[PDB]
Structures are given as structure tokens and as C-alpha cells.
Amino acid sequence: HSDLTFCEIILMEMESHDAAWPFLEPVNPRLVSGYRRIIKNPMDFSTMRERLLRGGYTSSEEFAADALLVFDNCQTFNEDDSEVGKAGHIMRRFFESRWEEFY
Ligand SMILES: Cn1cc(C(=O)NCCCNC(=O)c2ccc(F)cc2)ccc1=O
């Protein structure tokens, strides 16, 4: 239980974060030119939320894997000085920050 409760806390704080807007819903490939070709395994906060409520997380490790997948995708597709890039850096630093002050 207590392993996924802090996953609920982390995901809640990330969902309500100021810099969270580029990762709340899945990237719409019809809108983002080149995203389908470059990102082979897309991930966002809503998909992690769905899988968390539906229970499909065996441990905190798969959850953390999905978050790091969000930010790996962000850094793969967007420049570090793009708006999505800067947001993604703030969100990644926030996630590792809060994740480390539990484990
Ligand atoms: C995680 N992540 C998020 C985004 C992102 O959120 N991008 C803005 C949202 C798209 N929404 C639009 O409305 C739109 C799209 C294209 C256009 F030409 C005009 C408007 C992009 C790359 C990425 O890796």
C-alpha cells in the first residue's frame, strides 16, 4: 500500500504543478509535426493516472519508469530552451526532488 500512496502524492503534485501543462494529456500527433516519428513510446500524466487508479502498477519502480519516460520523451523531442523544454526541465527536477525525499 504505502509504496503507491506516495505515487499518488507525487502524481497529484505533478498534475497540479505550474509547469505541468505540456504533460497533462497525450501529445496530439496531428498537431505536433514529427512527434509520431520521433517518440516511440509516448507517456503523459493522464495515462499514468489511468493506470494508477486502475491499479496497473506493480511497484513504485514502474511508476517512476513512466515518469522518467515522460521527461526522456520531452528532452528527445524539444529543445532545452523551448517552452516545452523549459517546462519539462522544471517538471523533471521537481519529480526527482520529491521522489528522493521518500526513498
Ligand atoms: C510533451 N510535449 C508537449 C508538447 C505540447 O504540448 N505542444 C503544444 C500543444 C499543442 N496544441 C496546439 O494547440 C497546437 C499545436 C500545433 C500548432 F502548430 C498550433 C497549436 C509538444 C512536444 C512534447 O514533447
Curated annotation (Swiss-Prot):
Deacetylation by SIRT1 in late S phase enhances pRNA-binding, allowing de novo DNA methylation and heterochromatin formation. Acetylation is high during S phase and declines to background levels in late S phase when the silent copies of rRNA genes are replicated. It is found in: Nucleus, Nucleolus. It comes from the Eukaryota. Residues 1-102 form the Bromo domain. Expressed at moderate levels in most tissues analyzed, including heart, brain, placenta, lung, skeletal muscle, kidney and pancreas. Belongs to the WAL family. The bromo domain and the PHD-type zinc finger recognize and bind histone H4 acetylated on 'Lys-16' (H4K16ac). These 2 domains play a central role in the recruitment of chromatin silencing proteins such as DNMT1, DNMT3B and HDAC1. Component of the NoRC-1 ISWI chromatin remodeling complex at least composed of SMARCA1 and BAZ2A/TIP5, which regulates the spacing of histone octamers on the DNA template to facilitate access to DNA. Within the NoRC-1 ISWI chromatin remodeling complex interacts with SMARCA1; the interaction is direct. Component of the NoRC-5 ISWI chromatin remodeling complex (also called the NoRC nucleolar-remodeling complex), at least composed of SMARCA5/SNF2H and BAZ2A/TIP5, which regulates the spacing of histone octamers on the DNA template to facilitate access to DNA. Regulatory subunit of the ATP-dependent NoRC-1 and NoRC-5 ISWI chromatin remodeling complexes, which form ordered nucleosome arrays on chromatin and facilitate access to DNA during DNA-templated processes such as DNA replication, transcription, and repair. Both complexes regulate the spacing of nucleosomes along the chromatin and have the ability to slide mononucleosomes to the center of a DNA template. Directly stimulates the ATPase activity of SMARCA5 in the NoRC-5 ISWI chromatin remodeling complex. This is Bromodomain adjacent to zinc finger domain protein 2A. The lineage of its organism: Eukaryota, Metazoa, Chordata, Craniata, Vertebrata. The chain holds residues 1796 to 1898 of 1905 of the full protein.
